Amino acid sequence: QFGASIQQQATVMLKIMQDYDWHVFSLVTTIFPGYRDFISFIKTTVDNSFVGWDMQNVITLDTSFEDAKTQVQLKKIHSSVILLYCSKDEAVLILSEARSLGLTGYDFFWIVPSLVSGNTELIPKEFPSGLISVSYDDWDYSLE
Amino acid sequence: QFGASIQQQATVMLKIMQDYDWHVFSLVTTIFPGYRDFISFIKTTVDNSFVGWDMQNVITLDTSFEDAKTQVQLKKIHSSVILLYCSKDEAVLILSEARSLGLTGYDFFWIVPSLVSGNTELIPKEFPSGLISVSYDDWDYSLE
Amino acid sequence: KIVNIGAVLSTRKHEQMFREAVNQANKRHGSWKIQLNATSVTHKPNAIQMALSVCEDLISSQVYAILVSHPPTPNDHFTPTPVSYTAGFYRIPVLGLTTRMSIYSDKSIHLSFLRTVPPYSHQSSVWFEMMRVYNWNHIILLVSDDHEGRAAQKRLETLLEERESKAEKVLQFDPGTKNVTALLMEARELEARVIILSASEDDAATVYRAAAMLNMTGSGYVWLVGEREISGNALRYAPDGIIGLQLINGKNESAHISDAVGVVAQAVHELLEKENITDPPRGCVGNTNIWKTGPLFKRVLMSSKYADGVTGRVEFNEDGDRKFANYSIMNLQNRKLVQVGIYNGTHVIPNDRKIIWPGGETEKPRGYQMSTRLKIVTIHQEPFVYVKPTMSDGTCKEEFTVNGDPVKKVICTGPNDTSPGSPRHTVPQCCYGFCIDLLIKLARTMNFTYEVHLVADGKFGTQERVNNSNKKEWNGMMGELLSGQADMIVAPLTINNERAQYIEFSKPFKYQGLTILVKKPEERITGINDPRLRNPSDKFIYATVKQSSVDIYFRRQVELSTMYRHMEKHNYESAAEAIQAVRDNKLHAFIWDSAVLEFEASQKCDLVTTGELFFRSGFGIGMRKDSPWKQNVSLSILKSHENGFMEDLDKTWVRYQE
């Protein structure tokens, strides 16, 4: 194939966070596979950075949420930048739960990977206007 | 009457909260009557105490909860000590929603008055084991 | 298949109208097999046996709705309470129709009471609509009925929660007395003229006579009353031009009965469409089991929404009150009731008739007149507030300074000594000095008179527990200012964060720090960083003025609790006591402001200050809350800052040495 990997995309997103000095952040991971490599890559990137990042503990989901034990970990979130790694189906429920929590504020940023960013036409109403996404979908360079 | 009013009982409960340094707390008031006097007495007692109480804003109710607009006010709660003034049949639904939203943790406290705590025999299973109550029902002093 | 309705009604014509409304209630509801029976009872002049007859007759009848419809009762108690209490024993809704007392608003007391009339506190919201129209902020409350007084205060604080303003004066007392004119004169000395009254007819007529004898009904005096205050001899004692309220169809019983029949009938036909039907048992003999669908039928009555009636959109709130009520606004023009406004549920519209006021023009009188004589209180500051006894009788010896400046004194009033020393000795003497000349400059800039008096003690004022009910109170200059007896504290006020939360501050005129007074081996201390003062003993005797703001500033310091425990055994009343004590070589250190001890070192060479300069702060003028005496006064202070008038005040006392 072509393009970047999920590790190079994570490097680009941490470069975005480095260029804006958003050093206080968090990390929320679901049960989508390839997640422990993602967490370990974030840990080795923070360990290989000139920043000294303020990383909150990883909020790990288990199943479809009862909104009883996951809410305890969601109320621990006092940082600004919220890092979410999930699929498109669970992202609607996560953003709706965060909107019900009031954790979708002006300082509460949301940066998502490329695979959760699905169809350009199909956009659910639960997306915050200002949702940061990174993908290789370039319209200036066509297929030819 | 040979009894103990709700104002002196609120004084005793705030004395308990002062003796435990439980200064960060909240207040949930339903549509059970005699509630604005309770809020005003709490406001005057906080304004006339050496603590300087860190009081979260009052979660108010209008009817039986839709779990749509009251859900936002309950998700604003992140403090430990929770005060409540309601009836027993309302308190069953309140504790059911609090268990459904995970507000019955080890950090979170629950202090109720004597009017919501009715018969000693009739105890439903939805009550958290550790529910703080203050009642003047002394079994050592009989009616005679 | 039957529904019984109980009623306490007197006149046979309205009983026939009630039975006709019951008969016409089953007209448009089809040919359904439900039946409606009505049982009406008369009235015996007593109240215990009336309650007995009505309660056992409605137990034997097993009714669902209980109605009391007697306005013109000769007894002024107006109590349908025992039948409502007996129905609340089985949780049966009693629909009260006549009275508007706030004791019925408590659903904890009246468990199953509903009504279609609001209490009078909602009229205050209509009066808050006056605040939405006439743009008036400061009010004067006067409530005699203490059963509704707490509810009126609650509703007033609920209305003032939006604008976040404060009522200037509230009053609650026992109805029946007559010598309330002292508090009326105390409200007359205030800036506002808004008069809110909530009492019966007798106290309203009493305060009308009190305002008529003292002429408190002149120009600009805002009067705003209700329906209870425009009846009886209070209507005879009312001044011309007073604005009152009128309940539209408040006493018109005939349409009100039909409205109640429609409400009860649609509530019953709504309840018939649901399950869990229960019936009231024969509770007179051997039945104490409660009616289980009490709160269920109450919840049915909560969401009751209607569209029929001459009055209009009758609707219950969470308190079961009346929504969207047409009110009238009346005026008393030459002992004649003249309608000057109408009111829908949200908005006031005046009619084509004019609004003639008891004062001057037909427009609104702005009854917010600021105090042209500002009551000035101060403490006896030694280089700033010089107080001299009079020569012969209330006079001031006009002595001249060495720089050709005549001392412009003022006749101030002050106590003699402390309260164990002097029981009651308060004389007028001559006050002059620094802040007196500052007030002379303020009176030269802006034209306003003043009234200089003195604080009763030698303390600034601290936040202390009062000896009952665990309540915070202030004292001193703050205690005399917040009580309304003072207007402007002209004193070197120590600016801190605690007092900024309670009152508003002006710009500081003085800028200085703190220092140590010693007498002249290390004879100097060089500030707080002396390790021997960290762990003191009986040798280094250091203290401060009792109940001073320096002690509060050290109380915020959570790392110097040892000095807070040490200085509490030697706190003096005034700073001059500390000057006299260190003059006799009994003290050793004293934390105090800089330039005062610099002036005292210029007076006495043995008084030596320390070298360090910490707590570099400023002293300004003690002020009230949001007030028009803030911006212009602060601009005058800044005008005094920009020119050489600060240097002139230095030439008077600061730059002058010996």
mmCIF file of N, CA and C in Angstrom, chain C residues 363-423:
data_model
loop_
_atom_site.group_PDB
_atom_site.id
_atom_site.type_symbol
_atom_site.label_atom_id
_atom_site.label_comp_id
_atom_site.label_asym_id
_atom_site.label_seq_id
_atom_site.Cartn_x
_atom_site.Cartn_y
_atom_site.Cartn_z
ATOM 1 N N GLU C 363 -45.711 61.619 34.950
ATOM 2 C CA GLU C 363 -44.671 60.631 34.705
ATOM 3 C C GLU C 363 -44.219 60.026 36.032
ATOM 4 N N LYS C 364 -43.317 59.046 35.956
ATOM 5 C CA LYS C 364 -42.901 58.341 37.167
ATOM 6 C C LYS C 364 -41.998 59.233 38.017
ATOM 7 N N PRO C 365 -42.243 59.325 39.326
ATOM 8 C CA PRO C 365 -41.331 60.070 40.204
ATOM 9 C C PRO C 365 -40.125 59.207 40.541
ATOM 10 N N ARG C 366 -38.941 59.676 40.164
ATOM 11 C CA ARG C 366 -37.708 58.975 40.507
ATOM 12 C C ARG C 366 -37.446 59.187 41.992
ATOM 13 N N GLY C 367 -37.886 58.238 42.814
ATOM 14 C CA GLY C 367 -37.760 58.351 44.251
ATOM 15 C C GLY C 367 -36.447 57.831 44.799
ATOM 16 N N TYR C 368 -35.378 57.964 44.017
ATOM 17 C CA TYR C 368 -34.034 57.575 44.429
ATOM 18 C C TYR C 368 -33.212 58.855 44.544
ATOM 19 N N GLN C 369 -33.318 59.503 45.696
ATOM 20 C CA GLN C 369 -32.585 60.728 45.976
ATOM 21 C C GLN C 369 -31.414 60.389 46.887
ATOM 22 N N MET C 370 -30.202 60.607 46.390
ATOM 23 C CA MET C 370 -29.001 60.298 47.148
ATOM 24 C C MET C 370 -28.852 61.245 48.335
ATOM 25 N N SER C 371 -28.145 60.769 49.357
ATOM 26 C CA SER C 371 -28.000 61.508 50.606
ATOM 27 C C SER C 371 -27.068 62.691 50.398
ATOM 28 N N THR C 372 -27.621 63.904 50.482
ATOM 29 C CA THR C 372 -26.806 65.104 50.368
ATOM 30 C C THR C 372 -25.961 65.346 51.611
ATOM 31 N N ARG C 373 -26.298 64.708 52.730
ATOM 32 C CA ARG C 373 -25.535 64.796 53.972
ATOM 33 C C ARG C 373 -25.000 63.401 54.279
ATOM 34 N N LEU C 374 -23.769 63.134 53.858
ATOM 35 C CA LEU C 374 -23.176 61.812 54.021
ATOM 36 C C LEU C 374 -22.662 61.649 55.445
ATOM 37 N N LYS C 375 -23.187 60.654 56.156
ATOM 38 C CA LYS C 375 -22.772 60.395 57.528
ATOM 39 C C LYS C 375 -21.363 59.815 57.544
ATOM 40 N N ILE C 376 -20.428 60.557 58.125
ATOM 41 C CA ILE C 376 -19.016 60.192 58.127
ATOM 42 C C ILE C 376 -18.662 59.638 59.499
ATOM 43 N N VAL C 377 -18.107 58.432 59.522
ATOM 44 C CA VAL C 377 -17.600 57.832 60.745
ATOM 45 C C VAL C 377 -16.111 57.569 60.551
ATOM 46 N N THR C 378 -15.356 57.678 61.642
ATOM 47 C CA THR C 378 -13.918 57.483 61.592
ATOM 48 C C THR C 378 -13.431 56.997 62.948
ATOM 49 N N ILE C 379 -12.182 56.546 62.968
ATOM 50 C CA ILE C 379 -11.509 56.141 64.190
ATOM 51 C C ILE C 379 -10.491 57.228 64.522
ATOM 52 N N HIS C 380 -10.135 57.322 65.802
ATOM 53 C CA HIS C 380 -9.158 58.318 66.217
ATOM 54 C C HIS C 380 -7.757 57.899 65.793
ATOM 55 N N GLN C 381 -7.384 58.224 64.559
ATOM 56 C CA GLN C 381 -6.014 58.021 64.113
ATOM 57 C C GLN C 381 -5.160 59.174 64.616
ATOM 58 N N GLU C 382 -3.987 58.847 65.167
ATOM 59 C CA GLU C 382 -3.222 59.851 65.909
ATOM 60 C C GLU C 382 -2.599 60.937 65.026
ATOM 61 N N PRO C 383 -1.931 60.651 63.893
ATOM 62 C CA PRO C 383 -1.466 61.776 63.066
ATOM 63 C C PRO C 383 -2.494 62.276 62.070
ATOM 64 N N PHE C 384 -3.639 61.618 61.947
ATOM 65 C CA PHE C 384 -4.594 61.947 60.898
ATOM 66 C C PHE C 384 -5.879 62.558 61.426
ATOM 67 N N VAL C 385 -6.393 62.066 62.547
ATOM 68 C CA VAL C 385 -7.661 62.528 63.107
ATOM 69 C C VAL C 385 -7.339 63.133 64.470
ATOM 70 N N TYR C 386 -7.122 64.444 64.503
ATOM 71 C CA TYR C 386 -6.867 65.148 65.750
ATOM 72 C C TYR C 386 -8.192 65.598 66.347
ATOM 73 N N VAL C 387 -8.470 65.145 67.565
ATOM 74 C CA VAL C 387 -9.702 65.462 68.275
ATOM 75 C C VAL C 387 -9.337 66.311 69.485
ATOM 76 N N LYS C 388 -9.927 67.500 69.567
ATOM 77 C CA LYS C 388 -9.628 68.469 70.601
ATOM 78 C C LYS C 388 -10.902 68.839 71.350
ATOM 79 N N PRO C 389 -10.868 68.908 72.681
ATOM 80 C CA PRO C 389 -12.054 69.350 73.427
ATOM 81 C C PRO C 389 -12.369 70.815 73.172
ATOM 82 N N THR C 390 -13.649 71.152 73.323
ATOM 83 C CA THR C 390 -14.115 72.502 73.052
ATOM 84 C C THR C 390 -13.655 73.465 74.144
ATOM 85 N N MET C 391 -13.577 74.745 73.782
ATOM 86 C CA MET C 391 -13.067 75.749 74.708
ATOM 87 C C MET C 391 -14.110 76.134 75.751
ATOM 88 N N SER C 392 -15.238 76.697 75.312
ATOM 89 C CA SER C 392 -16.278 77.138 76.231
ATOM 90 C C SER C 392 -17.561 76.328 76.088
ATOM 91 N N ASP C 393 -18.171 76.315 74.899
ATOM 92 C CA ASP C 393 -19.401 75.552 74.689
ATOM 93 C C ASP C 393 -19.503 75.257 73.193
ATOM 94 N N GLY C 394 -19.100 74.050 72.800
ATOM 95 C CA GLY C 394 -19.241 73.592 71.426
ATOM 96 C C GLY C 394 -18.460 74.373 70.394
ATOM 97 N N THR C 395 -17.400 75.062 70.798
ATOM 98 C CA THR C 395 -16.648 75.928 69.905
ATOM 99 C C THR C 395 -15.269 75.342 69.625
ATOM 100 N N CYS C 396 -14.646 75.852 68.565
ATOM 101 C CA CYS C 396 -13.318 75.427 68.142
ATOM 102 C C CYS C 396 -12.414 76.647 68.095
ATOM 103 N N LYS C 397 -11.289 76.581 68.805
ATOM 104 C CA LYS C 397 -10.317 77.669 68.793
ATOM 105 C C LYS C 397 -9.610 77.695 67.446
ATOM 106 N N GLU C 398 -9.867 78.739 66.660
ATOM 107 C CA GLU C 398 -9.328 78.849 65.304
ATOM 108 C C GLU C 398 -7.863 79.267 65.380
ATOM 109 N N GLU C 399 -7.010 78.290 65.672
ATOM 110 C CA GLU C 399 -5.578 78.528 65.721
ATOM 111 C C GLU C 399 -4.977 78.437 64.322
ATOM 112 N N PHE C 400 -3.829 79.083 64.152
ATOM 113 C CA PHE C 400 -3.159 79.169 62.864
ATOM 114 C C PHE C 400 -1.849 78.395 62.911
ATOM 115 N N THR C 401 -1.510 77.753 61.795
ATOM 116 C CA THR C 401 -0.271 76.997 61.711
ATOM 117 C C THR C 401 0.906 77.925 61.426
ATOM 118 N N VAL C 402 2.106 77.339 61.419
ATOM 119 C CA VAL C 402 3.323 78.105 61.161
ATOM 120 C C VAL C 402 3.523 78.424 59.689
ATOM 121 N N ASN C 403 2.773 77.782 58.794
ATOM 122 C CA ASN C 403 2.885 78.018 57.362
ATOM 123 C C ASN C 403 1.748 78.879 56.824
ATOM 124 N N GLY C 404 1.064 79.619 57.693
ATOM 125 C CA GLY C 404 -0.009 80.487 57.252
ATOM 126 C C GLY C 404 -1.274 79.778 56.832
ATOM 127 N N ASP C 405 -1.464 78.529 57.257
ATOM 128 C CA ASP C 405 -2.640 77.766 56.877
ATOM 129 C C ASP C 405 -3.597 77.711 58.056
ATOM 130 N N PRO C 406 -4.787 78.301 57.958
ATOM 131 C CA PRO C 406 -5.758 78.179 59.051
ATOM 132 C C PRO C 406 -6.369 76.786 59.098
ATOM 133 N N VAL C 407 -6.477 76.250 60.310
ATOM 134 C CA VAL C 407 -7.016 74.910 60.512
ATOM 135 C C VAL C 407 -8.537 74.991 60.433
ATOM 136 N N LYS C 408 -9.116 74.331 59.434
ATOM 137 C CA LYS C 408 -10.567 74.288 59.264
ATOM 138 C C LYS C 408 -11.080 73.040 59.970
ATOM 139 N N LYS C 409 -11.476 73.207 61.229
ATOM 140 C CA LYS C 409 -11.958 72.101 62.040
ATOM 141 C C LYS C 409 -13.410 71.780 61.682
ATOM 142 N N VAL C 410 -13.979 70.796 62.378
ATOM 143 C CA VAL C 410 -15.386 70.454 62.216
ATOM 144 C C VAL C 410 -15.908 69.991 63.572
ATOM 145 N N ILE C 411 -17.199 70.212 63.809
ATOM 146 C CA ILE C 411 -17.834 69.796 65.056
ATOM 147 C C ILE C 411 -18.234 68.331 64.888
ATOM 148 N N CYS C 412 -17.451 67.436 65.476
ATOM 149 C CA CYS C 412 -17.732 66.010 65.463
ATOM 150 C C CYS C 412 -18.293 65.587 66.816
ATOM 151 N N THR C 413 -18.868 64.389 66.860
ATOM 152 C CA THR C 413 -19.426 63.838 68.090
ATOM 153 C C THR C 413 -18.724 62.529 68.413
ATOM 154 N N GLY C 414 -18.259 62.393 69.653
ATOM 155 C CA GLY C 414 -17.513 61.217 70.036
ATOM 156 C C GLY C 414 -17.673 60.844 71.496
ATOM 157 N N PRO C 415 -17.580 59.549 71.791
ATOM 158 C CA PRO C 415 -17.557 59.104 73.188
ATOM 159 C C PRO C 415 -16.259 59.487 73.881
ATOM 160 N N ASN C 416 -16.261 59.352 75.208
ATOM 161 C CA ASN C 416 -15.131 59.845 75.987
ATOM 162 C C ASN C 416 -14.063 58.768 76.149
ATOM 163 N N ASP C 417 -14.437 57.620 76.705
ATOM 164 C CA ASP C 417 -13.500 56.543 77.008
ATOM 165 C C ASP C 417 -14.150 55.218 76.625
ATOM 166 N N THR C 418 -13.556 54.125 77.102
ATOM 167 C CA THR C 418 -14.091 52.797 76.833
ATOM 168 C C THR C 418 -15.351 52.543 77.654
ATOM 169 N N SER C 419 -16.052 51.460 77.324
ATOM 170 C CA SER C 419 -17.328 51.163 77.976
ATOM 171 C C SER C 419 -17.228 50.747 79.448
ATOM 172 N N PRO C 420 -16.232 49.976 79.921
ATOM 173 C CA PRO C 420 -16.081 49.862 81.383
ATOM 174 C C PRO C 420 -15.612 51.145 82.042
ATOM 175 N N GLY C 421 -14.827 51.964 81.348
ATOM 176 C CA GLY C 421 -14.387 53.231 81.896
ATOM 177 C C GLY C 421 -15.475 54.283 81.888
ATOM 178 N N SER C 422 -15.973 54.616 80.697
ATOM 179 C CA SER C 422 -17.036 55.599 80.548
ATOM 180 C C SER C 422 -18.341 54.882 80.249
ATOM 181 N N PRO C 423 -19.338 54.928 81.143
ATOM 182 C CA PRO C 423 -20.629 54.293 80.844
ATOM 183 C C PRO C 423 -21.399 54.986 79.728
#
